[PDB]
Design the sequence.
């Protein structure tokens, strides 16, 4: 089952965190990351097209994120606003989609 | 600008309803319809890839829906459970996706 977890779980303000992703389905179009516990386009961080390996910012993009080809998400110079939940949506080639939510806590 | 509306807005139990879709963006991979007001994989009705013109059922699929190449969704022999909100997610080529929510009322 698709899952995501934060390394580290508790993050000091101004440092770094990596959202690891495990168990990606086969045959994907792309990835979309969202701030919060649900898919919500108004809160999209980034969209990643696998076919072209291209990332594109959403409205929630801070400029401090970096998504990787396996959907992992790096955030640098973490701020208070970065704290809390993140939701990854994986878009499969049949447009039937899966989500996983994770969190980390800034201090 | 992406919107959806029901025809008819008030629907007799056992009849038919067409969810019309307006202002699709350019450059999309496909469509994802969900029951309710938000994107939620657990409530996904159908996924549709415009390149292959293939429909695939999600967990919320009743077997009474038909999706069209312009994302329009036909529901036949409408039940009480069908009532309420539907949400369309349009998957864009850059994976920064768009949503539109509509509804109809069964009586
Ligand atoms: C400094 C952070 C940049 C490094 C690139 C992040 C890529 C990490 O990605 C990780 O590769 C691991 C090895 O299999 C897997 O366990 C993980 O599922 C995956 O999340
Ligand atoms: C009962 C069978 C009806 C099939 C409906 C086919 C889809 C119709 O769809 C509609 O076609 C119109 C012209 O493009 C547009 O006004 C609409 O945006 C569109 O939703």
Sequence:
């Amino acid at each position: 089952q698709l899952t995501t977890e934060s390394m580290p779980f508790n993050v000091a303000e101004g440092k770094e965190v990596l959202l690891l992703v495990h168990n990606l389905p086969q045959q994907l179009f792309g990835y979309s990351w969202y701030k919060g516990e649900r898919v919500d386009g108004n809160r999209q961080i980034v969209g990643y097209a696998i076919g072209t390996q291209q990332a594109t910012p959403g409205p929630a993009n801070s400029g401090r994120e970096t998504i990787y080809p396996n959907a992992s998400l790096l955030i640098q110079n973490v701020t208070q606003n970065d704290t809390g939940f993140y939701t990854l949506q994986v878009i499969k080639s049949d447009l039937v989609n899966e989500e996983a939510t994770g969190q980390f806590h800034v201090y």
User: Anything to note?
Assistant: Residues A 18, 20-22, 68, 70, 72, 74 surround octyl beta-D-glucopyranoside (ligand 1) (CB under 6 Å). The two ends of chain A are 30 Å apart (CA to CA). The interface with chain B takes residues 29-32, 38-41, 44, 46-49, 54, 56-58, 89, 91-99 of chain A (CB under 8 Å). Residues 1-107 of chain A form a domain with the Immunoglobulin-like fold (CATH 2.60.40.10).
